[PDB]
Enzyme design. Structure first.
Site, mmCIF file in Angstrom:
data_model
loop_
_atom_site.group_PDB
_atom_site.id
_atom_site.type_symbol
_atom_site.label_atom_id
_atom_site.label_comp_id
_atom_site.label_asym_id
_atom_site.label_seq_id
_atom_site.Cartn_x
_atom_site.Cartn_y
_atom_site.Cartn_z
ATOM 1 C CG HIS A 272 45.949 43.668 41.721
ATOM 2 N ND1 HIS A 272 45.354 44.802 41.803
ATOM 3 C CD2 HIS A 272 45.986 43.387 40.228
ATOM 4 C CE1 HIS A 272 44.990 45.235 40.589
ATOM 5 N NE2 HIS A 272 45.476 44.246 39.610
ATOM 6 N N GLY A 273 45.420 40.572 45.246
ATOM 7 C CA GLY A 273 45.825 39.672 46.161
ATOM 8 C C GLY A 273 46.630 40.301 47.587
#
Ligand SMILES: CCCCCCCCCCCCCCCCCC(=O)OC[C@H](COP(=O)([O-])OCC(O)COP(=O)([O-])OC[C@@H](COC(=O)CCCCCCCCCCCCCCCCC)OC(=O)CCCCCCCCCCCCCCCCC)OC(=O)CCCCCCCCCCCCCCCCC
Ligand SMILES: CCCCCCCCCCCCCCCCCC(=O)OC[C@H](COP(=O)(O)OCCN)OC(=O)CCCCCCCCCCCCCCCCC
Ligand SMILES: CCCCCCCCCCCCCCCCCC(=O)OC[C@H](COP(=O)(O)OCCN)OC(=O)CCCCCCCCCCCCCCCCC
Ligand code: HEC
Ligand code: HEM
Ligand code: HEM
Ligand code: HEM
Ligand SMILES: COc1c(O)c(C)c(C/C=C(\C)CC/C=C(\C)CC/C=C(/C)CC/C=C(\C)CC/C=C(\C)CCC=C(C)C)c(O)c1OC
Ligand SMILES: COc1c(O)c(C)c(C/C=C(\C)CC/C=C(\C)CC/C=C(/C)CC/C=C(\C)CC/C=C(\C)CCC=C(C)C)c(O)c1OC
Lengths: 369, 64, 41, 162, 184, 240, 43, 76, 98, 54, 41
Positions: free
Chosen positions: D127-128
Site C-alpha cells: 500500500h505504499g
C-alpha cells in the site's frame, strides 16, 4: 406427486414475464456456475492436501499426474472468474431495472455476495503459492478487538499451516451455505415474481417457464460454457497471476501485491482512503452500499427504461467502476492515486447523492412531483 | 556464428536504432563529464534496447 | 411473592435476572465444583 | 407464578452456564494449539553498512541492518516530533551503525522491501508505506513504526535478537 | 412471512398426536446428532490432514496439542455411536408401531440409513489406524463380489491396486460431503 | 517494471490451435541436461514425463539410467544410490536450497519446472534473458556475481551467461548457435511448464467444432419454441 | 416521520423507554459474562 | 400462480403454431434495421462515459511514463 | 421549457410504446388504490396499453412513431384518483401522528 | 507418572519410541518446566540442515 | 417425410435414433476432428 407438484409450481409452470431480456438469464447461470464450482471443487478435493509442505506439490500433482486434472483445476479457477462475471452482471441488472424494491431478495443477495467473496478469497489462498500467502497475510491484518481477531483467524502469530487447513475447511463448507441461501433467495422472489425491463406490472402478460425460459436458459448455459471453455482451453492464464506459480516464500516479498481482478474495485477504494480503518470501512461500504440501495429509491418509476438522466448516471457509475478496477492494478504513484481518490469519491456520490436527486428531477419533468 | 547477432546487425542499420544510440553516447559522455552524478544511462539504453530488441525479434526467429 | 412482581413478571426483568444470575452462577458453580473434584482426588 | 418461573429462571442460568461453556471450548479450539504457542541467532559481521538482513525469526522477517555515516546522520536529523511515530533513530537502535527491525508493515502485515522507497529505508509494495532507515513510517498509510525486537549485541560480529 | 410460515408450518402449529411416547423423541435426537456430528466434524477438519504419512500424526496432534481437541474428537466418535443407537431405536419404533405404511417416508428413511452407514464406514477409515486400513481393504474388496466389475469397482474406489493414500483422500472428501446430502 | 518487456517472438505454438514442435522440445531437454541441470532443478518433472514426448519409454529409460539416485536406506539403514528409473524424477543439483546459496554466491537458482509459467511473458523473457547479457551502460556498475541483463529485474542476475555459441552439440546436428539453443530450451521449459499443451489444443479444436455445430441448432430450437409468441398478434376489442 | 413519530408517538416513546433500557442491560450483562469481558467483570 | 393473476377483459390474442411459421422470418431483413434502430436510441447514453474512460486510461499511462522519464534538468 | 419537456417526453420513450404517464408510474399501494377507483373503461384500456408495451418489449420493437402517444396526447387519467387516495392517507397519517 | 517417566528414560527408551510425546508433555505437575528444560537439554537431538547445507 | 413417420414421430423411436446416431457420431466426430487438428499442427 407433492414434490413434483411443488417443482411444477416453482420451475415447470411458474408465471413469468414474457419480455425479460437475456440479462435475466444471468442468475440461473450463477446457479449453474455454483454447481460447476462445487463439482470441480469436489474433484479437486480427492487429491488436494491442506499441508504447507505438500499443498503446492499436490496442486502440481493434480496438474501433471491425475488424468485430466489440469482440466478440472483450470475449470475451477476460470469458473470462479465466470462466477464473478455473472455476479457483477446480475447485480448490475438489479441496479438498472429497479429490482432492489424486492427488498428481502436484495438483502439475501448481498449476503450471498459477501459469502461468495469470502469463499473465493480463501480458495485463492488454498494453492499456497507466493501470491496466495502474501495476499493472505494482508487481508487478515486488515481485520486488525482487531489484533485478537486477526490472530484467531490466522490461528497463530502469522498465517502458516494453521491458516491453510482452516481455510480449506471453510472454503469447503461455505458453498453449501451459499446453496441454502440461494434457495432462500429463490423463495423470497417467487412470493413476488420476477421483474421486467419496462418496470411495469406484467400480470397481464405472463407465460410459462418450461418451454419459454427454459430453452432460453439452456441457450445461455451453452454460451456461458463456450466462454468458459475458450477461457480454459485457449487462454488458461490470462486472468490469473504468474507469481502464483512460485512456492510461498515468507522471506521473499513480491514487488507488487494484488488480489484477483474482481476484488480490484474494492482494492482501489481501500488504497484511496489514507486512514487504514477508513479504508477498511469504505471497502465494506463499497459492497454494503448496495444493501443500502432500496432506501435510496425516490422515483415513481421502478425501472430505468424510461429514465434517461439516471441512465446516464448509471453508465457513469459503470464507467468509474471499470476505472477503479484499472487503478487497483496500477502501482502506487502519480497520478494513479488521485484518480483512485476521485473515482471513489465519484462512486459514493453517484450512488448516495446523484441518483435520488436525478429521480426527483425526472419526476418533476413528468409533472408528477 | 549467431543469426541473432546478424539480425542485430541488420537491426543496427535501422535508423531508429542509431537515433537511440546517439542519445546513449551523449549521456555516456554526460555521465563522464559529471564526475559525481548518479545519472545513469539505463534510462537511455533501455529505450535503445527496446527498439533494437523489438526489431531484432521481428526479424529474429524468422531468421532462426 | 415480591420477587415475582419485581424480577420475574416483566419479561425484560426476567431476562435481566437470568443473565445476572448466570454471570455469578459460573463463579459459584466452578468454585463449588472444583472443591468437590479436589476433595475427590 | 414465582415458584414456577423461578424454576424457569433457575434452569435458564444453568443452561446458559453450560451453553457458554460448550461454545467457549469450541471457540477456543480454533485458537493457537500448544505446538505453536510453544531463540535467535545473528552475526554482526554478516551485515555491512547500508544493508539489511533477515532470518525469519518467529516466522516473520527479522530485518537486521547496518547504517552509514550519512545514513546514521540523516535519521538523527529526522524530526522526531514531526515523525508519524515519535521514535528517534537511536531510540530504536543500541548502535547507530546497527539497526534491527521486524518486517511486518504496521499496515496489513506485508514485508517492507529494503533499499527501495523515497526515504532510503524501506517501502511496502502492498500500500505504499515508506519507512526511513530507522524503520519509522514516514509516508503512506502504515500506522506505526516498524517494531524493534529486544535484541542482544552479543559480539562486535554477533547478535542475539530477542 | 414466507420464511416463518414454513417454520410455523413444521414446528409450532403442526398438529401432533397427543399420546406419542418418548420413542417419538428419537428422530429429533437423530437430527440433533447430525448437527452435532457436522459441528464436531468441522472442528476436526481444521486440523486433520488426509495424507497417509500425516493422518495419524494429525489425529494425535488434535488429541494432544489443540485446546480441547481430544474433547471434540471423542465427541465425534461417541456421537457417531449415539447416532447409530438413536437410528436403531428409530427404526425399531417404525417397525413396532406400523409406521412403515407411510411408504415414501419409509423409503427416504432406508436411503438415509444407507447413506449414514457409508458415511460412518469412511469416517472410521479416516484416522488411518491399523484397524482402519485393513477394514477398508475388506469392504472395498467386498465389492469384488461383482462378477465382472467387482475388481474394477474395487480398483476404482481404492483408486489403485490396494487401498493407499489414493483412498484416504477420496474417503475424506466423501465423508465430508455426504452428511449434507443426509441433511437434504 | 524497469525492464524491457521482452519482445514477442513468432513461436510455432503461438497460434490458437498451434501445438509445440517436439523436436525442439527434445533439443531443449538436451540443452537442460547438458547445461541447465548443474544449477537448476526440475522437481515436478519425472523422467517418465519425457516418455511419449520427444522420447520413448526405452529412450527415457537409458536417459534415466545414465544417472544415479539414492533409493533410501533400504532395510539396513543404508542410504544407497541406484540408476534412475522411469519413475524417478529429475535429479537435484543440491540437497537443500542453502547449498544452492553457498554454491551460487548467495543467489538461489529457481525451479525451472514452471519458470515459463511463473515469469511474466515467460517464453519471451527466458529467450531474452538467456540472450540478453548485454554490457552494462555507463552510470551503472554491478558487483561480482552480477550481470547486466536488461530483462532481468534490476538487470543484475547472479546467473552468469550460460549459453555460449556452440556450448553443446545437438545430437540432431542442427547447428548449435546460441539462439538455436535458447529457442529450444524456451520451447522445452514451456513444455515442462505445461506438458498438456498439445493435448489441450486438440480438445479445444473439438470444442470449437462441437459448439459450431450445437449453437445454431439450439438457437433454432429456441426460436421455434419462441416463434409462437413472437408472432402473437394482440388486439384490443372493447365491446364499445 | 411524524407518521410514526408524532406528538402522540413521543408519549409512546417514553412509555416504552424503560423496557428498552432493560433489554440493553440484559444484553450488556450477557456480553460482559459471555465474552468474559474482563474490564467490566473485574469490577 | 397461472390463473387468478389479474383482471384482463375484452382482448383478443391471436397466435400461430411453431411448425406453421417460418423459423427466422425476415431475420436479417429487419433484424439489421432494428438492431441499428436500437443502437441509435441508446448510444448517446452508453458510449461517452466509456470514451472518457479510454481517454483517462491513456492519459494515466502516458502521464505515468512521463513521470518515470528521467528529469533531464535534474542530475546536470 | 415545455419544448424540452416534450423532448424529455420523447426521451422517456413510453410514447414509443404508447404508454400514458400514469401507465408508467411504478405500482404502489396508493397507486393501486387509485387504480381500483378507476372506472372500468380506463382500467380495461390501461390494461391493454400495458400489455401492448410488454409485448413490444418482448420483441424489442417500438410502435410506429405515428401511433406513438404525443406529449400533448398523453393524459393524466389516474392523476386525480391518486390525489384523493394520497390526501386521505395524509389525513389518516396526521390523525395518527396526533 | 514422574517415576514411570524416569523408568522409561533409563530403561525403556533404548528400544521403544514415543513419537507423539514431546518434552512439552513433560512440563506439568510431575515435571515442572525447567525440570523439563534440563531433561530436554540432557539429550542432543539433531536440529537438522545448516545454512552451510548440512 | 418418411423418416418422420418412421424414426422421429414415436418418441421411443426418437430416442432410438438419437442414441444410435450418437453412438456413431462420436466415431465420426473424433475421426474428422482429429484429421483437422493434425493438419493444423
Ligand atoms: C447483426 C447481424 C444479424 C442480425 O441482424 O441479427 C438480428 C438479431 C436481432 O433481431 P431482432 O428481431 O431485432 O431481435 C429478436 C431476437 O432475434 C430474438 O432472439 P434473442 O436475441 O432474444 O435471443 C436470446 C438471446 C439469449 O442470449 C443469452 O442467453 C446470452 C447469455 C449471456 C451471455 C453469456 C454469458 C457470459 C458473458 C460474458 C461477458 O440470444 C441472443 O441474444 C443471440 C444468441 C446467438 C446464438 C448464436 C448464433 C450464431 O440480432 C441478434 O440476435 C444478435 C446476435 C446474433 C447476431
Ligand atoms: C452493456 C451494454 C448493453 C446495452 O446495449 O445497453 C443498452 C441497454 C438499454 O436497455 P433498456 O433501455 O432497458 O432497453 C431494453 C429494450 N429496449 O442497457 C442494458 O442492457 C441494461 C443494462 C443492465 C445490466 C448492465 C450491467 C452493467 C455492468 C454492471 C457491473 C457493475 C454493477 C454493480 C457492481 C457492484
Ligand atoms: C443536450 C443534448 C443534445 C443532444 C443532441 C443530439 C440529437 C438529439 C435529437 C435527435 C435524436 C438522436 C438520437 C436520440 C437518442 C436518445 C436521446 C438522447 O440521446 O438524449 C440526449 C441524452 C439525454 O439527455 P438528458 O439526460 O436530458 O441530458 C442531461 C445531461 N446530463 O443526453 C446525452 O446523451 C448526453 C450525455 C452526456 C454525458 C457526459 C458525461 C461526462 C462525464 C463522464 C464521467 C465518467 C467518469 C470520469 C472519471 C471519474 C473519476 C476520475
Ligand atoms: C540453460 C541455457 C539455462 C536457462 C534457460 C536458464 N539458466 Fe539459469 N540461473 C543460475 C543461477 C545461479 C540463477 C539465479 C541468479 C539470480 O537469481 O540472481 C539462474 C536463474 C535463471 C532464471 C530465472 C531468472 C529470474 O528472473 O528469476 C532463468 C529463467 C534461467 N536461469 C534460465 C545458474 C545457471 C547455470 C549454472 C552456471 C546454468 C548452466 C544455467 N543457469 C542455465 C540456464
Ligand atoms: C464446495 C465446493 C468447493 C470445493 C470443494 C472447492 C475446493 C477447492 C480446492 C481444493 C481448491 C484448491 C485447488 C486449486 O488450486 O484450484 C480450490 C481452489 C479455488 N477455489 Fe474452490 N472449491 C469449491 C467451491 C468454490 C467456489 C464456489 C469458488 C468461487 C467463489 C471457488 C473458488 C476457488 C478459487 C478462486 C480457487 C483458486 C484457484 C487457483 O489456484 O487459481 N471454489 N477450491
Ligand atoms: C449467489 C449468486 C446468486 C444466485 C445463484 C442468484 C440466483 C438468482 C436466481 C435464480 C434468480 C431468478 C432468475 C433471475 O431473475 O435472474 C435471481 C433473481 C434475483 N436476484 Fe439473485 N442470485 C445471486 C446473487 C444475487 C445478488 C448478489 C443479488 C443482489 C444484488 C441478487 C438479487 C436478485 C434480484 C433482485 C432478483 C430479481 C430479478 C428481477 O425480478 O428483476 N441476486 N437470482
Ligand atoms: C460433514 C460433517 C463431518 C465431517 C466434516 C467429519 C469429519 C471427520 C474427520 C476429519 C474425522 C477424522 C478425525 C477422527 O479421527 O475422529 C472423522 C472421523 C469420524 N467420523 Fe466424521 N465427519 C462428519 C460427519 C460424520 C457423521 C455424520 C458421522 C456418523 C455417521 C461421522 C462418523 C465418524 C467416525 C465414526 C469417525 C471415526 C472416529 C474415530 O477415529 O474413532 N462423521 N470425521
Ligand atoms: C421466474 O422464472 C424463474 C423461475 O421460476 C425459477 C424457479 C428459476 C430458478 C431456476 C434455476 C435453474 C436456478 C439457477 C440454477 C441453480 C442450480 C441454482 C429462474 O432462474 C427463473 O428465471 C428468472
Ligand atoms: C409431527 O411430525 C413431525 C414433524 O412435522 C417435523 C417437522 C419434525 C422435525 C423436528 C425436528 C426436531 C427435526 C428437525 C429437522 C431436521 C432435518 C433435523 C436435522 C437438522 C439439522 C440442522 C441437522 C418431526 O420430528 C416430527 O415428528 C414428531
Amino acid at each position: 406427486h407433492p414434490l413434483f407438484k411443488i417443482i411444477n409450481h416453482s420451475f415447470i409452470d411458474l408465471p413469468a414475464p414474457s419480455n425479460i431480456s437475456s440479462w435475466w438469464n444471468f442468475g440461473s447461470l450463477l446457479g449453474v456456475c455454483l454447481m460447476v464450482q462445487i463439482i470441480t471443487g469436489l474433484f479437486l478435493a480427492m487429491h488436494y492436501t491442506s499441508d504447507t509442505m505438500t499443498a503446492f506439490s499436490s496442486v502440481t500433482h493434480i496438474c501433471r499426474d491425475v488424468n485430466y486434472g489440469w482440466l478440472i483445476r483450470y475449470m475451477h479457477a476460470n469458473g470462479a472468474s465466470m462466477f464473478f462475471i455473472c455476479l457483477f452482471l446480475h447485480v448490475g441488472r438489479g441496479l438498472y431495472y429497479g429490482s432492489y424494491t424486492f427488498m428481502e431478495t436484495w438483502n439475501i443477495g448481498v449476503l450471498l455476495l459477501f459469502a461468495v467473496m469470502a469463499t473465493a478469497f480463501m480458495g485463492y489462498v488454498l494453492p499456497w503459492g507466493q501470491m496466495s500467502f502474501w495476499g493472505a497475510t494482508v487481508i487478515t491484518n486488515l481485520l486488525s478487538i482487531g489484533t485478537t481477531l486477526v490472530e484467531w483467524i490466522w490461528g497463530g502469530f502469522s498465517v502458516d499451516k494453521a491458516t491453510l487447513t482452516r481455510f480449506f475447511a471453510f472454503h469447503f463448507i461455505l458453498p453449501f451455505i451459499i446453496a441454502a441461501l440461494a434457495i432462500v433467495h429463490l423463495l423470497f422472489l417467487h412470493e413476488t415474481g420476477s421483474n421486467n425491463p419496462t418496470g411495469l406490472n406484467s400480470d397481464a402478460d405472463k407465460i410459462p417457464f418450461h418451454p419459454y425460459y427454459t430453452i432460453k436458459d439452456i441457450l445461455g448455459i451453452l454460451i456461458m460454457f463456450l466462454i468458459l471453455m475458450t477461457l480454459v482451453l485457449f487462454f488458461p492464464d490470462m486472468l490469473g497471476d504468474p507469481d502464483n506459480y512460485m512456492p510461498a516464500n515468507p522471506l521473499n516479498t513480491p514487488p507488487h501485491i494484488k488480489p484477483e481482478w474482481y476484488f480490484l474495485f474494492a482494492y482501489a477504494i481501500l488504497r484511496s482512503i489514507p486512514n487504514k480503518l477508513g479504508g477498511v470501512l469504505a471497502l465494506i461500504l463499497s459492497i454494503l452500499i448496495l444493501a443500502l440501495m432500496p432506501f435510496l429509491h425516490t422515483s415513481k418509476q421502478r425501472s430505468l427504461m424510461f429514465r434517461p438522466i439516471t441512465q446516464i448516471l448509471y453508465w457513469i457509475l459503470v464507467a468509474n467502476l471499470l476505472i477503479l478496477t484499472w487503478i487497483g492494478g496500477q502501482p502506487v504513484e502519480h497520478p494513479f492515486i488521485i484518480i483512485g481518490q476521485l473515482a471513489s469519491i465519484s462512486y459514493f456520490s453517484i450512488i448516495l447523492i446523484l441518483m435520488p436527486i436525478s429521480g426527483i428531477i425526472e419526476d418533476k419533468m413528468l409533472k408528477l412531483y | 556464428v549467431d543469426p541473432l547477432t546478424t539480425v542485430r546487425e541488420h537491426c543496427e542499420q535501422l535508423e531508429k536504432c542509431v537515433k537511440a544510440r546517439e542519445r546513449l553516447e551523449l549521456c555516456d559522455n554526460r555521465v563522464s563529464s559529471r564526475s559525481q552524478t548518479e545519472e545513469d544511462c539505463t534510462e537511455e539504453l533501455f529505450d535503445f534496447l527496446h527498439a533494437r530488441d523489438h526489431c531484432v525479434a521481428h526479424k529474429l526467429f524468422k531468421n532462426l | 411473592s415480591r420477587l415475582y412482581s419485581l424480577l420475574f413478571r416483566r419479561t425484560s426483568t426476567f431476562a435481566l435476572t437470568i443473565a445476572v444470575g448466570a454471570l455469578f452462577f459460573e463463579r459459584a458453580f466452578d468454585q463449588g465444583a472444583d472443591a468437590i473434584y479436589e476433595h475427590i482426588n | 407464578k414465582g415458584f414456577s418461573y423461578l424454576v424457569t429462571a433457575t434452569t435458564t442460568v444453568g443452561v446458559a452456564y453450560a451453553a457458554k461453556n460448550v461454545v467457549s471450548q469450541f471457540v477456543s479450539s480454533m485458537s493457537a494449539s500448544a505446538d505453536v504457542l510453544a531463540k535467535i541467532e545473528i552475526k554482526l559481521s554478516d551485515i555491512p553498512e547500508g544493508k539489511n538482513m533477515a532470518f525469519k525469526w518467529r516466522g516473520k522477517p527479522l530485518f537486521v541492518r547496518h547504517r552509514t555515516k550519512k545514513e546514521i546522520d540523516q535519521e538523527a536529523a529526522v524530526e522526531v516530533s514531526q515523525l508519524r511515530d515519535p521514535q528517534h533513530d537511536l531510540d530504536r537502535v543500541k548502535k547507530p551503525e546497527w539497526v534491527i527491525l521486524i518486517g511486518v508493515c504496521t499496515h496489513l502485515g506485508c514485508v517492507p522491501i529494503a533499499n527501495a522507497g523515497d526515504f532510503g529505508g524501506y517501502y511496502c509494495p502492498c500500500h505504499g508505506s515508506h519507512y526511513d532507515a530507522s524503520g519509522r513510517i514516514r509516508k503512506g498509510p502504515a500506522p506505526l513504526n516498524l517494531e524493534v525486537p529486544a535484541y542482544e549485541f552479543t559480539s562486535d560480529d554477533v547478535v542475539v535478537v530477542g | 412471512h414466507p420464511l416463518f410460515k414454513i417454520i410455523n408450518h413444521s414446528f409450532i402449529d403442526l398438529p401432533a398426536p397427543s399420546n406419542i411416547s418418548s420413542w417419538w423423541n428419537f428422530g429429533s435426537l437423530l437430527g440433533v446428532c447430525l448437527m452435532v456430528q457436522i459441528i464436531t466434524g468441522l472442528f476436526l477438519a481444521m486440523h486433520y490432514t488426509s495424507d497417509t504419512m500425516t493422518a495419524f500424526s494429525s489425529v494425535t496432534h488434535i488429541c494432544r496439542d489443540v485446546n480441547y481437541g481430544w474433547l471434540i474428537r471423542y465427541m465425534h466418535a461417541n456421537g457417531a455411536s449415539m447416532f447409530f443407537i438413536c437410528l436403531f431405536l428409530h427404526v425399531g419404533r417404525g417397525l413396532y408401531y406400523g409406521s412403515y405404511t407411510f411408504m415414501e417416508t419409509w423409503n427416504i428413511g432406508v436411503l438415509l440409513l444407507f447413506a449414514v452407514m457409508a458415511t460412518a464406514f469412511m469416517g472410521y477409515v479416516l484416522p488411518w489406524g491399523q484397524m482402519s486400513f485393513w477394514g477398508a481393504t475388506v469392504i472395498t474388496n467386498l465389492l469384488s463380489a461383482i462378477p465382472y466389475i467387482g475388481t474394477t469397482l474395487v480398483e476404482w474406489i481404492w483408486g489403485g491396486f490396494s487401498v493407499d493414500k489414493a483412498t484416504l483422500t477420496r474417503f475424506f472428501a466423501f465423508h465430508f460431503i455426504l452428511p449434507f446430502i443426509i441433511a437434504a | 517494471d524497469l525492464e524491457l518487456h521482452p519482445p514477442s517472438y513468432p513461436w510455432s505454438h503461438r497460434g490458437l490451435l498451434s501445438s509445440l514442435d517436439h523436436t525442439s522440445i527434445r533439443r531443449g531437454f538436451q540443452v537442460y541436461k547438458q547445461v541447465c541441470s548443474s544449477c537448476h532443478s526440475m522437481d515436478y518433472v519425472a523422467y517418465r514425463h519425457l516418455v511419449g514426448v520427444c522420447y520413448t519409454e526405452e529412450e527415457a529409460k537409458a536417459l534415466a539410467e545414465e544417472v544415479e539416485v539414492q533409493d533410501g536406506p533400504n532395510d539396513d539403514g543404508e542410504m544407497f544410490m541406484r540408476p534412475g528409473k522411469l519413475s524417478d524424477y529429475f535429479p537435484k543439483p543440491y540437497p537443500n536450497p542453502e547449498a544452492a546459496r553457498a554454491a551460487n554466491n548467495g543467489a538461489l537458482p529457481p525451479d525451472l519446472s514452471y519458470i515459463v509459467r511463473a515469469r511474466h511473458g515467460g517464453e519471451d523473457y527466458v529467450f531474452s534473458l538467456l540472450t540478453g547479457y548485454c554490457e552494462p551502460p555507463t552510470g551503472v556498475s554491478l558487483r561480482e556475481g552480477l550481470y547486466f541483463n536488461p530483462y532481468f529485474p534490476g538487470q543484475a542476475i547472479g546467473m552468469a551467461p550460460p549459453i555460449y555459441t556452440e556450448v553443446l552439440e545437438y545430437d540432431d546436428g542442427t547447428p548449435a548457435t546460441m539462439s538455436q539453443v535458447a529457442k529450444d530450451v524456451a520451447t522445452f521449459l514451456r513444455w515442462a511448464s505445461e506438458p498438456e499443451h498439445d493435448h489441450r489444443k486438440r480438445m479445444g479444436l473439438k470444442m470449437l467444432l462441437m459448439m459450431g455445430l450445437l449453437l445454431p441448432l439450439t438457437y433454432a430450437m429456441k426460436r421455434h419454441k419462441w416463434s409462437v409468441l413472437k408472432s402473437r398478434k394482440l388486439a384490443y376489442r372493447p365491446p364499445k | 416521520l411524524s407518521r410514526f413519530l408524532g406528538p402522540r408517538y413521543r408519549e409512546l416513546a417514553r412509555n416504552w423507554i424503560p423496557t428498552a433500557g432493560m433489554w440493553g442491560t440484559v444484553g450488556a450483562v450477557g456480553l460482559v459474562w459471555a465474552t468474559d469481558w474482563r474490564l467490566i467483570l473485574d469490577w | 400462480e397461472f390463473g387468478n393473476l389479474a383482471r384482463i377483459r375484452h382482448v383478443i390474442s391471436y397466435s400461430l403454431s411453431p411448425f406453421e411459421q417460418r423459423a427466422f422470418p425476415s431475420y436479417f431483413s429487419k433484424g439489421i434495421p432494428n438492431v441499428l434502430r436500437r443502437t441509435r436510441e441508446r448510444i448517446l447514453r452508453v458510449a461517452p462515459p466509456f470514451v472518457v474512460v479510454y481517454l483517462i486510461y491513456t492519459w494515466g499511462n502516458q502521464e505515468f511514463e512521463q513521470s518515470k522519464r528521467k528529469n533531464p534538468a535534474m542530475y546536470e | 421549457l415545455d419544448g424540452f419537456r416534450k423532448w424529455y417526453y420523447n426521451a422517456a420513450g413510453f410514447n414509443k410504446l404508447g404508454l400514458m404517464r400514469d401507465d408508467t408510474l411504478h405500482e404502489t399501494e396508493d397507486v393501486k388504490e387509485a387504480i381500483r377507483r378507476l372506472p372500468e373503461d380506463l382500467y380495461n384500456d390501461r390494461m391493454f396499453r400495458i400489455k401492448r408495451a410488454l409485448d413490444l418489449t418482448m420483441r424489442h420493437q417500438i410502435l410506429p412513431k405515428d401511433q406513438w402517444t404525443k406529449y400533448e396526447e398523453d393524459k393524466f387519467y389516474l392523476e386525480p384518483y391518486l390525489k384523493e387516495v394520497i390526501r386521505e392517507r395524509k389525513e389518516r397519517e396526521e390523525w395518527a401522528k396526533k
